With several copies, the nearest count.
Chain A
Amino acid sequence: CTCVAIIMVSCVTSVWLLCRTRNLCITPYKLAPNAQVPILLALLCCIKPTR
């Protein structure tokens, strides 16, 4: 019970951290549609190509 509990909280906290970073990665580019989205960021903080 403890081990499922600790893996659950760690996994949820990790995914929360990651999705937070995902947002904080895309939003600068999201907001500024006309810039170039660096390829590395494009593939890693995986992104739609905006117009």
Chain B
Amino acid sequence: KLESDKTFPIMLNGQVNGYACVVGGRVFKPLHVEGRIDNEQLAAIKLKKASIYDLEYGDVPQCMKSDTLQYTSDKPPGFYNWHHGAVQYENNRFTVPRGVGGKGDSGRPILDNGRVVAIVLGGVNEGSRTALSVVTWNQKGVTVKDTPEGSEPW
């Protein structure tokens, strides 16, 4: 929870439009959020796009090279801490309480009890938990996107 100022709010027209998360020595932001990172040093890097995964990625400068979130592809079903609360992983599905998140909360990491387990991009109101669209990393650790049907970007 507290180790989240590694994550940085991007700004579009002055108000926080989304978040760009630094993991693994690399800055990620989702395409669907447009705007500028709220950090001069991070404002420079040429971000290379990847539509299939809906991420734009960039190698961080040295000065934060050692100060970057780690990740992990081990995701047992269970509770994983997230800025706005916990997320529950079950039936290979990432979900949150119904009515929390939405426009703007894209591109905020999901961490465990502190490595990244997922980075979130959207979600559909399943029920009285709300399913999420996340770019998870599979059991082999290759990155994959996970969209419940009809989810929409945040």
Residues of A bordering B, CB below 8 Å? 24, 27-36
Known contacts A27-B52, A31-B50, A32-B142; 12 further A-B pairs (Cβ under 8 A): A27-B50, A27-B57, A28-B144, A30-B57, A31-B143, A32-B73, A32-B141, A33-B24, A34-B141, A35-B140, A36-B140, A36-B141
Interface string of B135-148 (1 = CB under 8 A from A): 00100111110000
Q: In the assembled complex, which residues on chain A have CB atoms less than 8 Å from the CB atom of B71?
A: 32, 34
* A27, A29, A31, A35 pick with most chain B CB within 10 angstroms: A31
Q: Does B55 contact A (CB under 8 A)?
A: yes
Interface of A is mostly: helix
**What total of chain B residues lie within 8 Å of the partner, measured CB to CB?**
17
Query: Within the assembled complex, what's the spacing in Å between the Cα atoms of A35 and B73?
Result: 9
Bitwise interface map of B from 24 to 47 toward A, beta carbon under 8 Å scored 1, else 0? 101010000000000000000000
Q: Which 9 A-B pairs have the closest CB atoms?
A: A35-B141, A28-B142, A31-B143, A28-B143, A32-B143, A32-B137, A33-B24, A27-B50, A32-B141
Interface residues of B in 96-143 (CB under 8 A from A): 137, 140-143
Q: Which residues in B have their C-beta under 8 angstroms from that of A32?
A: 71, 73, 137, 141-143
- Provide the residues of chain B in CB contact with A33, threshold 8 Å: 24, 26
Q: How far is the CB of B85 from chain A (nearest CB, A)?
A: 27
Neighbouring A residues of B52 by C-beta, 8 Å: 24, 27
Residue in B26, B72, B140 whose beta carbon sits within 8 Å of that of A31 in the complex: B26
Q: Is the Cβ of B57 less than 8 Å from the Cβ of A31?
A: yes
CB proximity of A34 to chain B, nearest CB, Å: 6
What are 11 inter-chain pairs, A to B, with CB distance below 8 A?
Answer: A24-B52, A27-B50, A31-B28, A31-B53, A31-B143, A32-B71, A32-B141, A33-B26, A34-B24, A35-B73, A35-B142
